[PDB]
Amino acid sequence: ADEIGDAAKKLGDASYAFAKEVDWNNGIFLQAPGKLQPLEALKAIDKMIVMGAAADPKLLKAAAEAHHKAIGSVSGPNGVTSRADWDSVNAALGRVIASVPENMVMDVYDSVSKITDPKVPAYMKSLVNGADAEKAYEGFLAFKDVVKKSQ
């Protein structure tokens, strides 16, 4: 047990209602988040690849395992994993994030932002309950504070 795991349970309390509202089977998630821009997108993928190579390989393995288990508990009309598996994925990802330097994480974020059209967040939010999305994000903010402490 660790503090990221405890923070993941609070994150689940804040964010699972939102996860149940997302239609995970919508094909839109395969499309670029705006205009397809291969050269800029490759720069973002490169920052991810750098981060993945730097991450604790054991924590990467555990995060992959948590997603395998999560796939197994998918149910209902939107393809949402169970509450327990949601929390397990989020904890495992938090551990991976904490295992690399903050710069690496910020470089992925900035590089993905560069290819994301300004309308995409509002469009995604419009498909779910906006107050639940807001609660989920406020949950994320608290969670990342715990992740940073462990980083």
Among 6, 3, 11, 2, smallest CA distance to 141 is for 11
Reference 21, options 77, 101, 98; nearest CA is 77
Q: How far apart are CA 112 and CA 141, in angstroms?
A: 19
Q: Say whether residue 117 binds ligand J7Z (CB under 6 A).
A: no
User: What does the per-residue mask of binding to ligand PID show for 3-42, with x meaning CB under 6 A?
Assistant: ----------------x--x-xx-xxxxxxxx-x-x--xx
Binding part of the chain for ligand J7Z, among 17-25, 78-86, 88-96, 104-112 by CB under 6 A, reads 104-112
Q: State how far the Cα of 104 lies from the Cα of 52, in Å rounded to an integer.
A: 10
88's contact among ligand PID, ligand CLA, ligand J7Z, none, with CB below 5 to 8 A by partner kind, is none
CA distance 148 to 98: 6
Tell me the one-letter amino acid at 78: N
In the complex, the residues that contact a second copy under the rule CB under 8 A are: 24-25, 27, 30-32, 36, 38-39, 42, 45-46, 49-50, 52-53, 57-58, 60-61, 64-65, 67-68, 71, 74, 79
